[PDB]
Design a protein around this ligand. Structure first.
Ligand SMILES: *C(=O)[C@@H](NC(=O)[C@@H](Cc1ccccc1)NC(=O)CCCCCN=[N+]=[N-])[C@@H](C)O
Ligand SMILES: [Cl-]
Ligand SMILES: [Cl-]
Ligand SMILES: [Cl-]
Ligand SMILES: [Cl-]
Ligand SMILES: [Cl-]
Ligand SMILES: [Cl-]
Ligand SMILES: [Cl-]
Ligand SMILES: [Cl-]
Ligand SMILES: [Cl-]
Ligand SMILES: [Cl-]
Ligand SMILES: [Cl-]
Ligand SMILES: [Cl-]
Ligand SMILES: [Cl-]
Ligand SMILES: [Cl-]
Ligand SMILES: [Cl-]
Ligand SMILES: [Cl-]
Ligand SMILES: [Cl-]
Ligand SMILES: [Cl-]
Ligand SMILES: [Cl-]
Ligand SMILES: [Cl-]
Ligand SMILES: [Cl-]
Ligand SMILES: [Cl-]
Ligand SMILES: [Cl-]
Ligand SMILES: [Cl-]
Ligand SMILES: [Cl-]
Ligand SMILES: [Cl-]
Ligand SMILES: [Cl-]
Length: 454
């Protein structure tokens, strides 16, 4: 099944490296196609014939429960666009160990591995990692920072859309994330580009391969295609207080006589500050609780109300013609990545991600807990002590003070809120351009509203 061939493939690659080094083959000799073919064949025969012991990270009872879950409840994905395919990876947040996965609906009917082999755009699930997370890490925004959702066009002249909406006005990062509005994400990434932020440094530390970082739609998964396993590794980094661990299924290969062919080496990397990661956890908690883009919390509360009270955080994504739906879920202990789509890339139904995948993943999470009752954990995500708390205006997301609006030095006061920052000084004083993004026209309209309220 999917586990046998995934494990065999990874074991073969590790045996290939071992045999090449053992036989003292140069990096140069390894470039020779005939020599590579020989060493791949020799690696295969060594596993096939050799009596090696392959130790995996797979929790057999959990992985078996995930297979029974997709057998029993996979039909909940079928939405009247034909048989819907599925991939899921369950990952330990502290180690990057893969405890279990779903390769697809039924290996016997379709062998394609939707957990490790198929690459699709992660759509709006890019936003927390590539846009908001990095902006917070760089001290360019906090939890109650304001972004423009005013209408704006891509560089090709097309309006940036959210279903049938061309946009609204100013909104908090929280509203931007809960709805997954697109314009605020676009302005956030544009701000990173304008400031020359090394985005590629963050994404490559987490093992992402992105060919062009200049794509305006990058935060909406434009110019990005990822496996479920890889993308699960990104959400592992946010959930593990910003510390990446490389995903792995193989922990060790030993000869019969106990000689170590290969052993996984942990190389932890602080990709985001603890402040940034713990701020993002708080925002992604509200994405699921708000139930705007996913019914997941309603589905899970009904199936398993005790498990629904674990500290769930998550994010959804939908490609533009509903070809791909994503739901990424974490507790402090585990991350579960979920993709659905069609092997030939044709459209799912409009609600496939909102309802069907949410319901299926609620069943999958319940099946994992039933197989291993403590595995999700009862720990809460919590703000790191290094987080800076700023009292800011609800209206501007910046500290109270004086601003020049149309000549007249205006005293900006009103309702305040605590904003969480990952810098030293926290939020600055209100400036005229108080938000991420927006045109001179947008700001005229915004300030009109704010002055009216004083
Ligand atoms: C999040 O999921 C948002 N949608 C997307 O991110 C979609 C559509 C989109 C793109 C740019 C600006 C606004 C909306 N992203 C997307 O389709 C990118 C991947 C395209 C790759 C081509 N192959 N395919 N499929 C929701 C909330 O609007
Ligand atoms: Cl399997
Ligand atoms: Cl496979
Ligand atoms: Cl040999
Ligand atoms: Cl086991
Ligand atoms: Cl992968
Ligand atoms: Cl795609
Ligand atoms: Cl524009
Ligand atoms: Cl909201
Ligand atoms: Cl970059
Ligand atoms: Cl990648
Ligand atoms: Cl670039
Ligand atoms: Cl572009
Ligand atoms: Cl591996
Ligand atoms: Cl892997
Ligand atoms: Cl041996
Ligand atoms: Cl830190
Ligand atoms: Cl809730
Ligand atoms: Cl609901
Ligand atoms: Cl979405
Ligand atoms: Cl298909
Ligand atoms: Cl706790
Ligand atoms: Cl907290
Ligand atoms: Cl503080
Ligand atoms: Cl303050
Ligand atoms: Cl600072
Ligand atoms: Cl800006
Ligand atoms: Cl303008």
């Amino acid at each position: 099944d999917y586990l046998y061939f995934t494990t065999l493939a990874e074991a073969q690659e590790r045996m290939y490296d071992y045999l090449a080094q053992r036989d003292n083959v140069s990096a140069k000799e390894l470039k020779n196609e005939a020599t590579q073919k020989f060493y791949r064949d020799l690696a295969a025969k060594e596993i096939e014939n050799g009596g090696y012991k392959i130790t995996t990270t797979i929790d057999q009872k959990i992985h078996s429960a995930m297979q029974s879950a997709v057998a029993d409840y996979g039909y909940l994905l079928d939405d009247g666009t034909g048989r819907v395919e599925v991939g899921n990876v369950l990952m330990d947040n502290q180690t990057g160990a893969i405890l279990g996965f779903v390769g697809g609906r039924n290996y016997q009917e379709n062998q394609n591995n939707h957990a490790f082999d198929t690459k699709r755009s992660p759509a709006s699930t890019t936003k927390p990692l590539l846009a908001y997370g990095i902006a917070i890490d760089q001290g360019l925004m906090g939890s109650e920072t304001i972004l423009s959702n005013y209408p704006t066009n891509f560089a090709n002249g097309n309006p940036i859309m959210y279903a049938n909406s061309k946009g609204t006005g100013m909104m908090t990062l929280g509203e931007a994330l809960n709805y997954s509005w697109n314009i605020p994400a676009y302005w956030t990434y544009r701000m990173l580009r304008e400031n020359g932020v090394d985005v590629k440094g963050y994404m490559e530390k987490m093992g992402y391969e992105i060919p062009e970082y200049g794509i305006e739609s990058l935060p909406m998964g434009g110019g990005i295609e990822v496996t479920v396993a890889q993308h699960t590794n990104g959400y592992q980094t946010l959930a593990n207080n910003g510390v990446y661990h490389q995903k792995h299924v193989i922990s060790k290969i030993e000869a019969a006589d106990g000689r170590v062919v290969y052993e996984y080496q942990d190389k932890p990397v602080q990709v985001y500050s603890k402040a940034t990661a713990t701020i993002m956890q708080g925002l992604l908690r509200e994405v699921l609780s708000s139930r705007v883009t996913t019914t997941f919390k309603s589905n899970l509360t009904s199936l398993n109300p005790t498990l629904a009270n674990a500290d769930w955080i998550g994010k959804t994504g939908t490609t533009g013609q509903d070809e791909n739906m994503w739901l990424m879920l974490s507790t402090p202990r585990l991350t579960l990545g979920g993709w659905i789509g069609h092997d030939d890339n044709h459209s799912l139904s409009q609600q496939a991600g909102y309802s069907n995948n949410s319901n299926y993943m609620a069943h999958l999470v319940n099946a994992i807990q039933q197989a291993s009752p403590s595995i999700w954990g009862n720990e809460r995500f919590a703000l790191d002590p290094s987080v800076v708390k700023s009292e800011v205006l609800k209206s501007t997301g910046q500290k109270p003070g004086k601003v020049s609006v149309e000549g007249k030095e205006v005293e900006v006061t009103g309702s305040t809120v605590t904003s969480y920052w990952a810098n030293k000084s926290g939020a600055p004083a209100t400036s005229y351009r108080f938000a991420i993004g927006g045109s001179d026209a947008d700001y005229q309209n915004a300030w009109s509203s704010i002055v009216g309220s004083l």
